[PDB]
Ligand SMILES: *Cc1cc2c(cc1C)N1[C@H](O)CC[C@]13C(O)NC(=O)N[C@H]3N2C[C@H](O)[C@H](O)[C@H](O)COP(=O)(O)OP(=O)(O)OC[C@H]1O[C@@H](n2cnc3c(N)ncnc32)[C@H](O)[C@@H]1O
Ligand SMILES: [Cl-]
């Protein structure tokens with residue numbers, strides 16, 4: 001017999017951030033999660049996440065990235081958990097052959113972002129450990145960096161709970177009952193009601209949004225990352241080796257410097273197995289591509305980091321057709337907010353998104369420009385059942 005002002009289903013990257021924003025405003029909030037965030041069954045583990053500002057995916061992304069960066073700095077000051085390290089972010093690729101690099105450079109110029117432009121041997125000289133052909137160019141963002149994603153969610157949860165937010169763990173929501181003036185969720189642990197609902201189930205959005213009369217193409221992908229023993233005199237954060245996201249002939253790869261000798265971490269961004277969040281195999285190495293795809297990149301571009309595999313993780317991306325997020329009110333219910341399809345690049349924005357979700361839930365509007373994330377946009381191919 002407990003009503004809430006707002007109920008958040010899926011207390012992960014986006015949901016926990018939202019819960020923190022709501023709780024900080026004295027809003028009676030209930031956060032429900034299938035597991036106990038942060039955990040390793042969703043899209044937020046792997047310890048680290050990159051945050052860049054020269055977002056060429058769309059201008060709207062820049063302001064959100066900068067607001068998120070400020071929010072991350074605020075979180076750092078509010079918790080004892082480590083939140084962010086300014087490793088800087090390096091983006092490189094073949095000159096004139098990378099839409100990603102060109103887009104990044106354009107975004108930097110258009111928003112007057114502080115960056116360094118270098119090419120060929122200059123890259124190899126500035127960062128020993130990196131070996132790119134002379135026809136490669138790059139753009140470096142010194143003020144971007146690395147977020148400790150699990151710590152972010154953990155910190156937001158501890159802060160939210162301390163302010164009154166209730167967190168119901170290991171409880172999978174199975175259905176929704178929406179009315180013009182209230183929302184109700186159904187779980188094996190019971191039913192709950194509220195005035196507003198926020199839906200942010202990550203990979204599971206592709207399976208449960210249908211329970212909200214929504215038919216939106218969402219494809220979950222199995223994405224692995226690996227930690228490799230590396231030459232610490234070159235790849236350590238201590239010697240300023242940067243975080244990175246680059247485009248080479250066979251795709252986009254991202255990486256992180258070795259922290260406290262944990263080893264350089266690498267991931268293959270443009271490829272992943274299409275899976276279902278309930279049947280995905282979370283063991284690293286069951287597919288030969290898991291490790292081989294990573295080493296193929298390292299031996300060519302960062303040979304000193306192609307050492308023994310120290311650790312592996314299996315995580316998920318949830319892609320929309322245009323790879324842009326979905327942040328909007330349910331088209332048939334203004335009291336329901338949807339956060340889905342972050343397509344492999346949403347964590348850096350989670351702090352900002354939590355703020356947006358909080359505003360949408362409480363006012364039906366947000367001060368941020370979220371037009372490109374509309375649930376009604378054509379390229380999404382969204383429809384009602
Ligand atoms: C997986 C992965 C993602 C990202 C990155 C690497 C990997 C291996 N990096 C790379 O380094 C480059 C891109 C990225 C990075 O560094 N910078 C970014 O900005 N993003 C990067 N990645 C993407 C983000 O991690 C994802 O976009 C983000 O985490 C998505 O957040 P969202 O909140 O949607 O998903 P979560 O999985 O965090 O949370 C969902 C939660 O919901 C719960 N759940 C599910 N079903 C439920 C039911 N039925 N009832 C109640 N709760 C439910 C889950 O348990 C989960 O906690
Ligand atoms: Cl391949």
Ligand SMILES: [Cl-]
Nearest residue numbers: 317318343344
């Ligand atoms: Cl994602």
